[PDB]
Amino acid sequence: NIGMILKERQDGVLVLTLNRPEKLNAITGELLDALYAALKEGEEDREVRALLLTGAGRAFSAGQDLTEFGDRKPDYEAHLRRYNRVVEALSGLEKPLVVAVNGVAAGAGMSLALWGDLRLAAVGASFTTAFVRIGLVPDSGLSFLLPRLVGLAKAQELLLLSPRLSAEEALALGLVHRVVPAEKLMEEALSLAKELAQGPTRAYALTKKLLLETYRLSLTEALALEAVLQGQAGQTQDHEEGVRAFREKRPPRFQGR
Amino acid sequence: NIGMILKERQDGVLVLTLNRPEKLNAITGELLDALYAALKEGEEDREVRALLLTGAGRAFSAGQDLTEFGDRKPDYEAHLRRYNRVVEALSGLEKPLVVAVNGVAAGAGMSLALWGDLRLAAVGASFTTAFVRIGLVPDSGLSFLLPRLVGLAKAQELLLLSPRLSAEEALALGLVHRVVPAEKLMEEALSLAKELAQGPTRAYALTKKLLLETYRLSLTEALALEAVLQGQAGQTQDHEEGVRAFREKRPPRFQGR
Amino acid sequence: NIGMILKERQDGVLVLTLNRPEKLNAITGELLDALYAALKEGEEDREVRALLLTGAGRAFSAGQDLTEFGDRKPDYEAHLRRYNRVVEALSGLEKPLVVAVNGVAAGAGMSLALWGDLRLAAVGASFTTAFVRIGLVPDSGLSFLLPRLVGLAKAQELLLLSPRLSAEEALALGLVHRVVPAEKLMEEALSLAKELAQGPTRAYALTKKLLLETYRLSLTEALALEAVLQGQAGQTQDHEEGVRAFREKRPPRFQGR
Ligand SMILES: CC(C)(COP(=O)(O)OP(=O)(O)OC[C@H]1O[C@@H](n2cnc3c(N)ncnc32)[C@H](O)[C@@H]1OP(=O)(O)O)[C@@H](O)C(=O)NCCC(=O)NCCSC(=O)C/C=C/CC(=O)O
Ligand SMILES: CC(C)(COP(=O)(O)OP(=O)(O)OC[C@H]1O[C@@H](n2cnc3c(N)ncnc32)[C@H](O)[C@@H]1OP(=O)(O)O)[C@@H](O)C(=O)NCCC(=O)NCCSC(=O)C/C=C/CC(=O)O
Ligand SMILES: CC(C)(COP(=O)(O)OP(=O)(O)OC[C@H]1O[C@@H](n2cnc3c(N)ncnc32)[C@H](O)[C@@H]1OP(=O)(O)O)[C@@H](O)C(=O)NCCC(=O)NCCSC(=O)C/C=C/CC(=O)O
Numbered sequence: 001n002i003g004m005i006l007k008e009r010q011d012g013v014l015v016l017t018l019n020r021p022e023k024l025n026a027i028t029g030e031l032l033d034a035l036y037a038a039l040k041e042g043e044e045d046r047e048v049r050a051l052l053l054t055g056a057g058r059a060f061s062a063g064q065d066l067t068e069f070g071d072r073k074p075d076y077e078a079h080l081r082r083y084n085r086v087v088e089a090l091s092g093l094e095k096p097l098v099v100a101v102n103g104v105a106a107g108a109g110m111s112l113a114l115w116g117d118l119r120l121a122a123v124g125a126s127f128t129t130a131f132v133r134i135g136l137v138p139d140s141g142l143s144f145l146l147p148r149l150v151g152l153a154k155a156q157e158l159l160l161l162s163p164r165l166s167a168e169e170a171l172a173l174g175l176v177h178r179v180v181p182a183e184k185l186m187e188e189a190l191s192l193a194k195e196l197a198q199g200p201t202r203a204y205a206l207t208k209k210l211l212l213e214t215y216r217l218s219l220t221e222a223l224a225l226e227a228v229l230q231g232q233a234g235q236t237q238d239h240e241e242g243v244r245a246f247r248e249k250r251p252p253r254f255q256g257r
Numbered sequence: 258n259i260g261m262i263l264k265e266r267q268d269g270v271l272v273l274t275l276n277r278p279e280k281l282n283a284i285t286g287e288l289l290d291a292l293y294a295a296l297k298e299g300e301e302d303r304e305v306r307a308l309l310l311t312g313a314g315r316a317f318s319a320g321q322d323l324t325e326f327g328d329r330k331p332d333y334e335a336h337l338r339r340y341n342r343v344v345e346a347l348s349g350l351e352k353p354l355v356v357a358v359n360g361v362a363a364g365a366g367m368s369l370a371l372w373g374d375l376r377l378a379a380v381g382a383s384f385t386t387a388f389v390r391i392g393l394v395p396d397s398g399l400s401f402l403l404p405r406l407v408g409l410a411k412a413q414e415l416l417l418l419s420p421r422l423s424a425e426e427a428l429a430l431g432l433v434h435r436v437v438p439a440e441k442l443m444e445e446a447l448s449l450a451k452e453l454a455q456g457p458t459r460a461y462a463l464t465k466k467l468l469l470e471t472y473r474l475s476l477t478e479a480l481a482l483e484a485v486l487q488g489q490a491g492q493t494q495d496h497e498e499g500v501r502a503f504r505e506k507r508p509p510r511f512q513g514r
Numbered sequence: 515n516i517g518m519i520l521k522e523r524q525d526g527v528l529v530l531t532l533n534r535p536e537k538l539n540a541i542t543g544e545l546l547d548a549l550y551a552a553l554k555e556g557e558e559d560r561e562v563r564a565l566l567l568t569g570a571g572r573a574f575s576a577g578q579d580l581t582e583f584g585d586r587k588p589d590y591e592a593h594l595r596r597y598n599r600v601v602e603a604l605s606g607l608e609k610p611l612v613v614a615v616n617g618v619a620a621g622a623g624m625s626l627a628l629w630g631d632l633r634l635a636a637v638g639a640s641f642t643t644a645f646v647r648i649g650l651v652p653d654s655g656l657s658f659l660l661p662r663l664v665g666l667a668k669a670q671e672l673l674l675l676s677p678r679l680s681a682e683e684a685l686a687l688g689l690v691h692r693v694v695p696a697e698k699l700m701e702e703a704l705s706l707a708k709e710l711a712q713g714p715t716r717a718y719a720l721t722k723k724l725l726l727e728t729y730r731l732s733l734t735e736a737l738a739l740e741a742v743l744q745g746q747a748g749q750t751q752d753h754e755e756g757v758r759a760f761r762e763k764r765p766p767r768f769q770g771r
Contacts, residue, residue: 066760074753077745084737091733096417117413132721134760135714135752135768139744143724144736148409152662152725153688156631159721160610160710174410196417200392207389207416210400211409215472215729219348222401223341230396231334238392239331246323246391254392353674374670405666431667453674457649464646464673467657468666472729476605479658480598487653488591495649496588503580503648511649 003034006056007041012049012197013190014042021057026065027108029079032086039089049197049256051093052189053116054100063107063130080139083108087141090115091212094205095256096196100189101167101176106130111140114149114175117208118196120189121167122182127175128164148215149174200238201256260291263313264298269306269454270447271299278314283322284365286336289343296346306454306513308350309446310373311357320364320387337396340365344398347372348469351462352513353453357446358424358433363387368397371406371432374465375453377446378424379439384432385421405472406431457495458513517548520570521555526563526711527704528556535571540579541622543593546600553603563711563770565607566703567630568614577621577644594653597622601655604629605726608719609770610710614703615681615690620644625654628663628689631722632710634703635681636696641689642678662729663688714752715770 004025006017016038018025025031042048055061090097090112099116107130113119129146131138138146138159147155150173157163158173167179180188196204206229213225233239238254245252261282263274273295275282282288299305312318347354347369356373364387370376386403388395395403395416404412407430414420415430424436437445453461463486470482490496495511502509518539520531530552532539539545556562569575604611604626613630621644627633643660645652652660652673661669664687671677672687681693694702710718720743727739747753752768759766 066757074748075745076748077741080737080741080744084741087737088734117417132714132717133766134756135717135750135766136747136756137717137720137724137740137743139740141733141737141740143721143728143740144731144733145409147662147725147728148404150410151408151665151688152659153664153691155725157691159725160631160718174408177410177414200389203389203392203394204417206394207400210394211404211412211416212733214400214404216732217401218473219398219401219469220345223337223344223398226394226396226398226400227334227337227341229394230337231332233393234331234333236392242391242393243323252390252392374674402666405661407667408665431665434667434671457646460646460649460651461674463651464657467651468661468669468673471657471661474658475730476655476658476726477602480594480601480655483651483653483655483657484591484594484598486651487594488589490650491588491590493649499648499650500580509647509649 004031005034005038013193014048014051016053018055024059024062025055026062050193052098052193059103060101060105061109063109083140096204098193101125108140111142114145119176120178121176122185125167129162200254202236261288262291262295268451270450271305271308273310275312281316281319282312283319307450309355309450316360317358317362318366320366340397353461355450358382365397368399371402376433377435378433379442382424386419457511459493518545519548519552527707528562528565530567532569538573538576539569540576564707566612566707573617574615574619575623577623597654610718612707615639622654625656628659633690634692635690636699639681643676714768716750
């Protein structure tokens with residue numbers, strides 16, 4: 001398909017599938033533009049309360065297509081302003097994102113997978129940082145996410161030595177939250193995304209903003225931002241519903257506003 | 258008791274007990290003012306070298322009293338400047354704090370428990386972030402503490418899905434340092450707090466300041482603050498005692514100055 | 515030996531050995547000047563692509579020599595500008611550093627060991643923060659490294675209570691990456707350092723810069739620095755070699771430029 005991102009809506013969930021299975025969903029500028037466009041649509045679509053990202057075929061993504069750039073003096077500083085708006089869009093997404101890692105995620109493919117709020121892997125899936133084997137540094141936010149997700153000791157080993165991690169090893173480190181058999185991965189991930197699509201979408205979005213900023217703030221700054229964002233969550237119809245549901249001891253019926 | 262914070266001194270330890278057992282020690286502005294007052298007294302009392310915080314009855318704390326605010330347009334930005342001076346006081350406390358989590362700690366109750374320097378839980382105690390089920394974001398410093406304590410991967414799952422964690426699960430993640438039978442919790446926690454109340458109180462206070470600031474500093478800034486605070490610890494009578502005790506291979510007798 | 519740092523080159527590796535075995539490699543200003551000088555030489559020597567740091571005798575290092583300062587009013591703020599250029603040099607080293615922890619690492623000895631990019635310990639080796647037992651705060655970058663390496667929950671316990679950790683406990687926490695029998699430690703560590711000395715030295719150096727800065731940056735700042743440093747790695751002969759080797763499915767032959 002032109003752009004190489006498949007798009008499907010179900011029950012409040014936009015399902016995005018990386019679709020270059022013949023090249024293990026290797027990333028090109030074209031694929032990144034299509035993914036940006038799809039994330040923008042998902043976020044704008046008032047019928048969408050959650051996103052699910054997965055790969056077509058054997059792989060999640062092998063990362064940058066190492067054929068896309070033809071022997072010329074590479075300008076990665078320039079190009080990464082492109083990987084960069086996609087990462088900006090993922091990081092700031094105002095709806096929850098499930099990632100279903102169906103196979104290998106390497107390099108920027110591993111970066112993209114780790115931007116999921118909740119991450120599931122198939123048995124048989126694998127992670128490898130990859131960049132150092134091409135003489136490159138981690139990019140697409142991997143140098144930001146990895147030490148936060150697995151701690152600095154594991155981030156050093158994973159990045160410097162680029163070992164291949166099994167899905168069970170990934171589970172141990174916090175790279176994923178759940179490992180499921182390959183034939184059940186999309187059912188389980190879609191089940192979780194539909195759960196989140198009934199959730200308090202505004203609370204999810206603002207909680208994600210606090211988590212993104214937490215490490216660079218002083219405690220004083222963190223308490224100030226908590227105050228500001230709790231002010232905004234406090235004004236939502238969902239907060240009022242949440243309080244009613246607790247007082248009546250029934251499930252909340254959230255609307256995402 | 259008026260203010261709902263019980264206060265007792267033993268052997269250098271101020272014991273603070275959240276005391277609204279009939280509402281699972283649910284937090285009100287009144288309780289927060291009483292806790293602030295008690296922390297201020299503990300810190301000012303030269304007979305106190307350590308604090309121990311626990312709950313009365315079944316619960317540690319169920320967090321914000323979801324009856325305190327009566328159907329009016331809530332102003333959480335305003336109110337949190339109140340949760341906020343209490344968190345400021347906890348974070349900056351110039352004496353070590355043990356927390357004994359005797360039962361459920363939910364929402365701001367979980368926030369308060371996690372401000373302990375050393376944290377023990379009873380078998381049967383439990384943690385739940387709770388905020389997202391009311392359509393709110395984590396507050397009272399939970400968005401600051403949780404990713405630092407358990408890493409970002411576990412913080413995402415705990416905050417977005419609000420699962421109930423057993424004391425043994427909490428131990429695994431680093432939410433607590435020790436799990437003990439319910440009938441031994443106060444004996445063990447008081448034993449540890451009395452140990453710290455013989456400790457180098459100034460070294461504890463300055464070590465806590467370094468830990469609070471560590472993530473937002475450059476290595477250059479971190480080394481500069483280490484230099485400044487080690488300068489201050491170096492001038493204490495306790496440092497001179499610590500050096501004598503090491504040279505003579507005997508226990509130090511610290512005074513907290 | 516004058517300066518108490520032994521220096522030996524093998525197969526692209528500068529081997530540095532802390533050499534005051536009679537005082538468990540206890541740190542003095544003189545030892546720190548010698549270590550700074552040795553790190554500077556290793557980094558300047560175009561025949562060196564990796565460093566390995568270890569201890570002579572029983573210990574890795576017992577940390578500051580608690581005989582060096584003679585009963586005078588200590589000025590640790592002044593002196594730490596000395597521990598500080600050594601830590602600055604370690605942190606910014608533009609070649610990978612393996613640490614082989616052959617025995618106890620306490621206080622600043624533990625600080626120094628944890629500056630390794632990859633860390634191995636002998637069975638029988640041990641770690642202890644130590645500072646709090648002398649009434650001091652963690653220094654030599656320990657307040658920076660420890661919470662990043664083991665998370666805040668373990669850093670609090672390790673620093674406030676100064677327990678002695680076995681090599682297997684250290685492995686569990688991420689203080690080291692590998693534990694090996696004492697008689698195999700230098701063979702394994704030298705084997706790993708020779709591996710890294712064939713590696714893409716520029717990618718290692720720039721990856722280390724991203725990891726050092728990651729926690730204090732916004733995601734926007736982190737993506738900007740990734741762009742800048744990937745630009746520089748992209749211009750290296752090693753990047754061009756890495757791409758050729760992947761396209762031909764053969765091992766890269768990196769030069770470190
Ligand atoms: C671990 C995998 C991904 C999978 O192994 P396996 O499943 O055994 O497959 P394979 O290695 O046998 O490859 C099968 C085919 O896919 C191709 N393939 C795999 N990865 C990529 C790839 N990344 N680019 C182009 N082709 C790729 C292979 O070349 C093969 O093609 P062929 O059938 O021989 O024609 C392995 O292929 C691998 O290490 N690939 C390279 C991964 C890699 O280095 N990714 C790029 C890191 S750099 C990055 O992502 C961002 C860089 C930004 C700066 C910039 O460059 O703009
Ligand atoms: C996990 C517990 C805490 C305990 O379960 P369990 O032990 O089975 O007890 P229960 O749920 O059966 O409750 C027993 C009673 O306590 C009451 N209770 C429990 N939590 C609270 C509570 N937080 N507020 C008022 N009442 C509470 C229940 O309503 C019941 O009252 P009743 O006997 O029916 O009259 C459960 O009650 C629970 O999820 N409670 C709500 C926890 C909660 O959402 N906390 C607030 C999060 S929001 C926060 O803390 C800060 C917000 C700041 C912004 C602002 O609002 O200012
Ligand atoms: C865990 C060890 C390191 C090892 O135990 P073990 O292997 O059983 O040996 P030991 O304790 O029996 O000591 C054997 C000998 O080494 C000496 N030794 C051990 N550590 C040091 C030491 N750090 N300084 C001088 N001597 C030391 C002992 O005093 C003994 O000397 P002797 O044979 O009795 O003459 C234990 O010795 C120990 O706790 N030592 C003190 C560690 C310590 O507190 N280090 C300093 C932390 S403060 C720091 O590093 C930076 C401070 C900067 C501010 C400033 O001061 O400038």
